[PDB]
Amino acid sequence: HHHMRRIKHIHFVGIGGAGMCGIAEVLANQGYKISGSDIKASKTTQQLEENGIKVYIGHEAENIKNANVLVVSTAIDPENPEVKAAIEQRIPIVRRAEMLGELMRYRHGIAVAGTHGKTTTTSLLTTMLAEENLDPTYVIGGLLNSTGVNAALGESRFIVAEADESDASFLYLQPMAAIVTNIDADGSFDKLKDTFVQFLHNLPFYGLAVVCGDDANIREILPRVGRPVITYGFNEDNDIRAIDVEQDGMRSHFTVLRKGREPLRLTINQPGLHNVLNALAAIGVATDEGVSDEAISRALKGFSGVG
Numbered sequence: 001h002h003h004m005r006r007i008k009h010i011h012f013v014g015i016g017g018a019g020m021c022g023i024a025e026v027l028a029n030q031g032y033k034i035s036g037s038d039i040k041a042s043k044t045t046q047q048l049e050e051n052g053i054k055v056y057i058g059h060e061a062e063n064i065k066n067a068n069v070l071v072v073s074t075a076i077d078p079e080n081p082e083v084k085a086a087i088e089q090r091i092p093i094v095r096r097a098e099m100l101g102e103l104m105r106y107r108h109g110i111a112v113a114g115t116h117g118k119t120t121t122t123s124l125l126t127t128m129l130a131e132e133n134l135d136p137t138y139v140i141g142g143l144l145n146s147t148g149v150n151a152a153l154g155e156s157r158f159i160v161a162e163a164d165e166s167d168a169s170f171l172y173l174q175p176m177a178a179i180v181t182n183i184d185a186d187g188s189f190d191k192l193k194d195t196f197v198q199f200l201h202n203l204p205f206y207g208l209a210v211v212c213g214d215d216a217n218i219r220e221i222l223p224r225v226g227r228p229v230i231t232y233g234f235n236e237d238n239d240i241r242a243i244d245v246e247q248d249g250m251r252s253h254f255t256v257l258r259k260g261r262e263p264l265r266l267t268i269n270q271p272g273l274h275n276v277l278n279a280l281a282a283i284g285v286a287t288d289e290g291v292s293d294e295a296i297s298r299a300l301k302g303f304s305g306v307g
């Protein structure tokens with residue numbers, strides 16, 4: 001991937017906050033100098049230090065020394081001393097989602113959205129690409145148990161990332177493929193559906209959206225999407241269907257049907273009908289990306305979960 005013009009030192013304000021340390025880890029593995037700051041030392045900050053990322057405790061204006069850009073979680077608060085010093089010194093400040101957007105530039109990015117099941121689905125799809133030997137970069141909002149990290153840099157073109165709908169963060173992403181697991185109510189619910197539509201409009205006109213056709217709210221916004229859509233679910237009118245579902249204690253067995261493919265029997269190593277649906281979402285993108293049946297089966301059968 002190309003260098004970012006004149007960016008050598010990136011400083012994360014609130015690096016112990018959610019979503020921040022995974023981006024910092026990927027950028028660090030790419031060769032950027034990564035520093036950060038946070039209110040209180042934590043298991044996240046103690047660890048970031050262990051991989052060479054200096055993590056100041058307490059926000060002092062001097063913590064942004066030598067930084068070329070600052071990363072904040074969502075909004076820019078001028079009352080924060082590091083933020084205020086950066087504005088005084090004309091240092092750029094971007095939100096986390098915009099920095100994640102830049103990791104997708106020049107990559108084949110897959111953004112996993114939905115109200116529930118993003119972390120699980122992102123993990124499943126990442127494992128499927130790993131099993132196909134496609135070494136993906138990934139950014140998960142949780143510990144991938146198979147690797148022991150939230151996020152890692154891969155050498156392939158792929159990056160799989162959680163796409164957060166809160167604060168409309170995911171509109172800063174420019175993916176080549178997207179998942180929407182569900183759109184659940186519990187601003188207004190109508191604005192929220194609009195933003196999911198906007199998110200999919202960020203796909204290129206030829207990009208793929210894999211969405212759960214069992215969800216009535218997803219079904220409602222499909223006429224507005226204007227991109228290639230593949231629906232998954234249990235219902236009969238889905239492009240991708242799990243049938244013959246058997247809940248077997250901590251494991252589930254099902255058959256996935258896919259247009260132009262022979263029926264495929266699978267076992268997912270996690271309980272719950274929602275995780276069969278999450279696996280269908282990952283299967284959808286993985287199939288389109290060329291992942292073999294064997295890689296999909298191995299990934300699902302032995303799935304170590306997300307911490």
Ligand SMILES: Nc1ncnc2c1ncn2[C@@H]1O[C@H](COP(=O)(O)OP(=O)(O)NP(=O)(O)O)[C@@H](O)[C@H]1O
Pocket residue numbers: 114115116117118119120121141142162181182274275277278
């Ligand atoms: N498809 C689903 N539909 C509804 N609930 C689900 C689904 N998948 C998982 N869950 C539930 O959501 C909980 C958290 O799952 P997770 O995969 O971390 O979701 P997320 O979309 O990443 N959530 P958040 O990042 O907190 O907005 C799970 O432990 C389940 O209780």
Ligand SMILES: [Mg+2]
Pocket residue numbers: 115166
């Ligand atoms: Mg949430």
Ligand SMILES: [Mg+2]
Pocket residue numbers: 118119141162
């Ligand atoms: Mg999550």
